[PDB]
Amino acid sequence: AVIRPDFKFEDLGVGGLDKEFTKIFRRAFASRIFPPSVIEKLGISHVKGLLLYGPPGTGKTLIARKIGTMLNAKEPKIVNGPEILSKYVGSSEENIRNLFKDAEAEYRAKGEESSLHIIIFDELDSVFKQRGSRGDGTGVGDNVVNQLLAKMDGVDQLNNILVIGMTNRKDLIDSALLRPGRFEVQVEIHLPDEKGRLQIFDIQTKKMRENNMMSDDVNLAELAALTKNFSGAEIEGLVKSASSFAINKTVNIGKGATKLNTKDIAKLKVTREDFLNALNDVTPAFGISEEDLKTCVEGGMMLYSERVNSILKNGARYVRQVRESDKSRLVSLLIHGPAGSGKTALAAEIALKSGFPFIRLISPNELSGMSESAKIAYIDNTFRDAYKSPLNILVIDSLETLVDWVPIGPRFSNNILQMLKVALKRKPPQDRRLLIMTTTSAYSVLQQMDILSCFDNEIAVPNMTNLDELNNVMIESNFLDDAGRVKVINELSRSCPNFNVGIKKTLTNIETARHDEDPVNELVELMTQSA
Amino acid sequence: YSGKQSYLGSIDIDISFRARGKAVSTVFDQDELAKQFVRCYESQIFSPTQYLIMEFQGHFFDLKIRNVQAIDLGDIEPTSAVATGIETKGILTKQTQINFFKGRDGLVNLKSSNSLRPRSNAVIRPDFKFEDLGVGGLDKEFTKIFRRAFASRIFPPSVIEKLGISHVKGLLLYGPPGTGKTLIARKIGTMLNAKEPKIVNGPEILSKYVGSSEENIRNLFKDAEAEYRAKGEESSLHIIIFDELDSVFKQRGSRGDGTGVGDNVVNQLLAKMDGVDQLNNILVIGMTNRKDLIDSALLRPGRFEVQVEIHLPDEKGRLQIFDIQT
Amino acid sequence: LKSSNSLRPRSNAVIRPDFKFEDLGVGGLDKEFTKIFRRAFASRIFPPSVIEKLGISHVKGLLLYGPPGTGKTLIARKIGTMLNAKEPKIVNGPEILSKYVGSSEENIR
Amino acid sequence: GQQIFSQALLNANRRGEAKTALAEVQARHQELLKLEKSMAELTQ
Ligand SMILES: Nc1ncnc2c1ncn2[C@@H]1O[C@H](COP(=O)(O)OP(=O)(O)OP(=O)(O)O)[C@@H](O)[C@H]1O
Ligand SMILES: Nc1ncnc2c1ncn2[C@@H]1O[C@H](COP(=O)(O)OP(=O)(O)OP(=O)(O)O)[C@@H](O)[C@H]1O
Ligand SMILES: Nc1ncnc2c1ncn2[C@@H]1O[C@H](COP(=O)(O)OP(=O)(O)OP(=O)(O)O)[C@@H](O)[C@H]1O
Ligand SMILES: Nc1ncnc2c1ncn2[C@@H]1O[C@H](COP(=O)(O)OP(=O)(O)O)[C@@H](O)[C@H]1O
Phosphoserine (modified residue): where (chain C)? Predict the structure, then answer.
């Protein structure tokens, strides 16, 4: 009839997209399951158009290829877009109104007993662009749309045709075809989720595992975890790239001659390090984030005193509060302290430890070189994107620099400041949560601008002053031997007991002293000079 | 003269038809050829490039020993390097591994006997040194390229079929002017024992009549599809090289000409590189100076996977180039 | 066949031996002419054997630039019509462009 | 401030003119081959 009696969808390759399949099945072929008599008794018409769209390389063409064989359908007619056009006058419109002849004949012959004929238009946006483009030339690029529209709208009661159109850019499609009675249902295919990623990995490595060609060491769960934003095509590329490494241990290309170990050919086996190297080779094209924050804390923590622990605990308390309550849909925090004490690292650490689904960081590095309007648009888009997921953390770094503050004017950009002021107070749409954490070093200047009323709480980050903390950082950095580490501190105790430096400068001085002369004469000299 | 290496371990023989008009589609057993070779010529001394005339079942063939490996009695493993120099000579034995390759004419239809030997209509042949390409510098890019692209076509078909993967079908080379990104394409096209390359200059596709620009970009793949339908997975590599790629295949969506040809060409190429029908025996090479204008959909894996940057040389590269030129 | 070695003169030279810079008719520029006639028209006079034993190819480009009214077109004309070669294929400035979609590139081809 | 290109369609009449008269010349050629064969027999 319309679906084969022997089919369960477990065999078909497409994996990771199950909800979309159910939606398509429910809204497309459901009406053609019962005997016809019910439908007219219920006064419901059949659907005629289906549209699929998504980013490049998500699996739509796979669905189109396998649907015909999977669901006992008449061999679908497949035509590439730009193959319609032709040279002689009137040829193209004929070519379009030459595909529907079989359906018309069968309809006229057998009334409602006619089977279902399905034709799918690959690269739909190729020919059916906007029909008001203009150009003052050959009009064959417009009568094509008119012919298709005439045969699809003024069908003369053809109710046994379903057209499927796959595209990558919906915006380019002529608006005239997006209306009831013509391509009604539109299904979006987006990037897979982690479980879909595992399904895809299983499908790709099925045959490899079956023939004992994969070493037992490999663990698919770890790989699924590592591939943060990989689509299906990139996963397949990763698989074969990893296989190339295993291939390239027996056959040495270039070096020497062709030396094929006929014995190791039977022992060919992939392993984990090959997969890690393949991860090294292939890169995603989506990215967004989850790397900038990691590199922002590259130097790591040191827990040189209790203040770090207390601050981290307070951050944990706030993340818990935003995670639990449903009435607190917005929390903002300020982190202020002397310059160079280290602020961005702490915020990044807390954000990483939180483990929320959505995390991002806004810093002047990204915005550099843009025009002011571009900066405004970028900030607005970033906020709007952040307003999407159920839980969200947003980090703002060096607010004063984002506003171009210089104390000679004083000159600064008012538009950006006003936008940030209004944005920091906007609660997200219903049933969403946000946690904003902003850092600064010019507390007084913020006080003068009178934007201190949009922050719920403030956290200070005093720099270190006791020589004990210096000793801790020294021992953690492994600057010198134990005797030297003791001697330097005893000397500095009497050289300059009072101490106010920071953290960054300490590591810089440590390295410079290591390079030239690890003895006192350099490290202690610089340390005393700075303070 | 030899001292210890007195026997022949592995011998490679190129087989050709003495007369082009005597080509026969008969299936030749390599085991029978080796048996005849041992039966007729025993305890003889042979050297690389030495020629012979063989009469097998009334058919006359020209045999050229392309390479020879000399081994001493008692060597369990053939750890000796295969030598292409005429200096090496050996004595034929009833156990020498005889590998037959097609002659330069490529008319003899050999059987694969039951030996799972490397012998195939090879793309890369044996003994291929990077020192004969003639390109100085770029000694890491060549590795990467050959590992990712040609590493899977010189392997027994059964194993690659078991692994259930497919050969890559893209390659892109980009960099500043004058770094040597067209020499590589020429040498790859000429030195790989494949069909003649199908060179296309940058804007050589466009044409006046409506619907003829798109056809010119789908008349390049017709022969590949023609061969892939008949001989399955035994077809020879087909290679086509696009020069100055970024001239036509710009990001579709702008307003360039006012007619709308570039978008159609881009769509046709998109639909033909991956499409709904499998080809799996084609390769296309690209070159450009600006890699930020190419349409995004082209750069997805499955189309132009491997992308390489060719940059200015270092001091050792400069020395190598100076040595090559003079 | 193969090129052995024995060779002194060439069969159809380009510049011939009866040439001197006082015959062109361009006055003033004198060092420029030496440079031009050494870099470009010096590898087409030696016997082909030696030039083939050096493994070098000839230069295939020349550019002249300067203020307005100095002698560029005069040099081009004299070089074009005082040698032993095929007739020049002169092209004016925007004489390539055409109206149809793919006729300009064909005109350049 | 703008410019425009131009494309061209062939004449419908032409149609498949490659074989509009190819079929006809092929048919006449077949007639001429028949003529030649009959003349060969007659000369014999
Ligand atoms: N608690 C800490 N323990 C260990 N290392 C730290 C700590 N805090 C900061 N650092 C390190 O100190 C360095 C400076 O930190 P960071 O770049 O955040 O400085 P900052 O004071 O925010 O900068 P700026 O002065 O430019 O506003 C980084 O390498 C960071 O990893
Ligand atoms: N290793 C090398 N790298 C670069 N050039 C080389 C090298 N060895 C020799 N050459 C010489 O330098 C020339 C390099 O130019 P080539 O033909 O590769 O164009 P290209 O650098 O890709 O230029 P474009 O981007 O302008 O097309 C070659 O023609 C060759 O004569
Ligand atoms: N060096 C020269 N010796 C003799 N006559 C000269 C010289 N330079 C210029 N002239 C005279 O100038 C006239 C115009 O010069 P020419 O054709 O070289 O113009 P041009 O430099 O190409 O100018 P433009 O920039 O306007 O194209 C020539 O016909 C010639 O009579
Ligand atoms: N579930 C899946 N999702 C995405 N790609 C898949 C999936 N299963 C297999 N693939 C592989 O990814 C590719 C599908 O990409 P495709 O849909 O053809 O790209 P496009 O979206 O541009 O048409 C094929 O190589 C296919 O083998």
Answer: 11
